Amino acid sequence: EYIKLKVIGQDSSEIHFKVKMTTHLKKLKESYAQRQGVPMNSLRFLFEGQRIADNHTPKELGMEEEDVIEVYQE
């Protein structure tokens, strides 16, 4: 019921996250921003180019093992 997601930043660095299919993705967003040392609202998180909301889940978005989330400046 868990999958690994690769979060890729503008500098091509990666942080991977193991998440549940049903978990709201706010916690991933907050954790990634924390590790970059920037406010969460300074970033936007995309899956297949579409914005990931705080209450989106991997299941809702159709995500699969080793799928990529891209992070851009807001």
Binding site: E14, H16, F17, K18, K20, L28, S31
Partner: peptide, 10 residues
């Protein structure tokens, strides 16, 4: 300059 693997569990 190769980053190590980073996996965080939530």
């Amino acid at each position: 300059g190769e980053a190590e693997e980073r996996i965080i569990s939530l």
